Structure 1
Amino acid sequence: FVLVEMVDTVRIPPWQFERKLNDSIAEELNKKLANKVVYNVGLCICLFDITKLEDAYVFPGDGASHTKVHFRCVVFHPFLDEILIGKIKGCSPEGVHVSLGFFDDILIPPESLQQPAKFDEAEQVWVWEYGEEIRFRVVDESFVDTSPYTLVGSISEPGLGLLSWW
């Protein structure tokens, strides 16, 4: 979770003039940035606040009200060392499929660093014994439109001991 500065030219139709301008801008920004991953930024959750809002222009075309609004929004973007607590939403032979609680099923922990008893035989077996912890390692983003996903990240689980659960 981190704040990000953005400047958006929001277009409000003429039938929304009876509503408050700031509330309409906030609603439009939320609807535009709800469940979308901005490249090199992360997945935006919602709008935090609006800092600067200059004059509202009306173009000779569509005739709506275009406003250039400066705002801050919350995005989920770890700092390459953040610790998280997720739940195992499945498991694959090459690696477990853990997912943060109802947030995103994109965490793919590589099983190449635990103690030398690591293997998945497709029977949803996590690990042989001697709320799942996660340590983010690196981020990565990719594009979608390439002809006429985008956030997976790397997860680590060192020898944390885990006296509560093996």
Structure 2
Amino acid sequence: FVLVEMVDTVRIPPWQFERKLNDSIAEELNKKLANKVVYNVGLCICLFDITKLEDAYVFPGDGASHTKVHFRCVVFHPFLDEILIGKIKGCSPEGVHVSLGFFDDILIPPESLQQPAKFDEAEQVWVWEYGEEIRFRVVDESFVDTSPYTLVGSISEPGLGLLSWW
């Protein structure tokens, strides 16, 4: 979770003029930045606040109200060393499928660093004994449109001990 400064040109139709301008701007920014991943930024959650809001122009075309709004919004982007607590939403032979609680099913931990008893035989077996912890390692983003996802990240689970659960 981190704040991101953005500058957006929001278009409000004329039938929303009776509403307050700031409230409608916040609603439009939330509707435009909900469950979406900005490249090299991360998955945005919602709008945090609006810092600068300049004059509202009206163009000779559509005729709506165009406002350039400077705002700060919260996004989910670790700092390459953040510790998280997720739940195992599946498991593949090449790696377990852990998902943050109802947040995003995109965490794919590679099983190549635990103690030498690592294997997944497709029977949802996590690991042989001697709330699941997660150590983000690197971020990675990709595009979608290439003809006329985008966030997975690598997850580490070192020899943390885990006296509560093996």
CA shift digits 1:69-88 (9 cap, x unpaired): 00000000000000000000
Post-superposition offset of 1:146: 0.1
SS in 1 for 2:158: coil
Post-superposition offset of 1:122: 0.1
Post-superposition offset of 1:54: 0.1
Post-superposition offset of 1:154: 0.4
Structure 1: how far apart are the matches of 2:13 and 2:155?
44
Runs of 4+ in 1 over 3 A off after TM superposition: none
CA shift digits 1:44-97 (9 cap, x unpaired): 000000000000000000000000000000000000000000000000000000
Structure 1: how far apart are the matches of 2:157 and 2:146?
35
Post-superposition offset of 1:156: 0.2
Structure 2: how far apart are the matches of 1:24 and 1:139?
33
SS in 1 for 2:48: strand
What do you get for the CA RMSD once the two structures are aligned?
0.1
Post-superposition offset of 1:148: 0.1
Post-superposition offset of 1:14: 0.1
Structure 2: how far apart are the matches of 1:27 and 1:110?
39
Post-superposition offset of 1:143: 0.1
Post-superposition offset of 1:10: 0.1
Structure 1: how far apart are the matches of 2:56 and 2:126?
56
Structure 2: how far apart are the matches of 1:138 and 1:56?
41
Map of 2:84 onto structure 1: 84
Structure 1: how far apart are the matches of 2:122 and 2:35?
31
Structure 2: how far apart are the matches of 1:139 and 1:36?
16
Post-superposition offset of 1:4: 0.1
Map of 1:32 onto structure 2: 32
Post-superposition offset of 1:13: 0.1
Map of 2:58 onto structure 1: 58
TM-score (norm: length of structure 1): 1.00
Post-superposition offset of 1:101: 0.0
Gaps of 5+ in 2: none
CA shift digits 1:87-124 (9 cap, x unpaired): 00000000000000000000000000000000000000
Post-superposition offset of 1:157: 0.1
Post-superposition offset of 1:137: 0.2
Structure 1: how far apart are the matches of 2:77 and 2:24?
27
SS in 2 for 1:22: helix
TM-score (norm: length of structure 2): 1.00
SS in 2 for 1:25: helix
Post-superposition offset of 1:33: 0.1
Gaps of 5+ in 1: none
